[PDB]
Amino acid sequence: LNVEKINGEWFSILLASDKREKIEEHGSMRVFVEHIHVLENSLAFKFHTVIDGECSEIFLVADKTEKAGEYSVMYDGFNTFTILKTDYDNYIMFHLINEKDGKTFQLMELYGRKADLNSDIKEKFVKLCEEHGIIKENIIDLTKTNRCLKAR
Ligand SMILES: Cc1cnc(C)cn1
Ligand SMILES: [Cl-]
Numbered sequence: 417l418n419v420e421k422i423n424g425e426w427f428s429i430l431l432a433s434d435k436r437e438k439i440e441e442h443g444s445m446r447v448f449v450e451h452i453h454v455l456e457n458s459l460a461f462k463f464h465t466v467i468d469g470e471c472s473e474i475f476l477v478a479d480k481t482e483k484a485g486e487y488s489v490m491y492d493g494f495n496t497f498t499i500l501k502t503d504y505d506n507y508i509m510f511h512l513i514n515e516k517d518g519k520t521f522q523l524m525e526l527y528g529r530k531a532d533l534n535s536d537i538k539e540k541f542v543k544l545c546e547e548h549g550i551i552k553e554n555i556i557d558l559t560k561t562n563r564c565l566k567a568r
């Protein structure tokens with residue numbers, strides 16, 4: 417992948433986990449991307465999240481690890497992630513693994529360059545989730561949730 421080409425503004429579209437509580441309201445991973453800045457050794461993210469009904473910002477920096485294509489970041493424990501698929505100018509799919517207290521879960525995210533994506537791309541992401549043991553009932557379409565768009 418040419419990671420420089422993922423730079424810029426993105427929107428969170430679909431959000432999925434094999435630990436559903438983490439992506440429900442008040443879950444730590446119910447976060448909405450605004451941008452990804454590509455740096456030499458890292459990716460800098462800005463997110464929003466809802467806390468007690470109010471939009472709030474989260475800024476994270478993910479560092480390259482010793483494994484090609486993998487990044488790590490501390491947020492509600494220790495996370496690693498990789499990019500599964502992208503065409504740079506419409507969609508990107510991430511796969512992240514969280515560790516906390518020696519337990520783990522997966523998070524998968526579909527971001528778009530616009531506030532929504534078509535049904536074809538969504539469907540393909542759902543199948544990719546299933547390929548990781550993330551069942552359809554654990555995939556949330558954030559376009560029908562509060563994504564703090566007004567806060568962007
Ligand atoms: C919290 C978080 C979620 N997703 C990515 C890709 C990075 N950080
Ligand atoms: Cl809480």
Ligand SMILES: [Cl-]
Nearest residue numbers: 562563564565
């Ligand atoms: Cl919204």
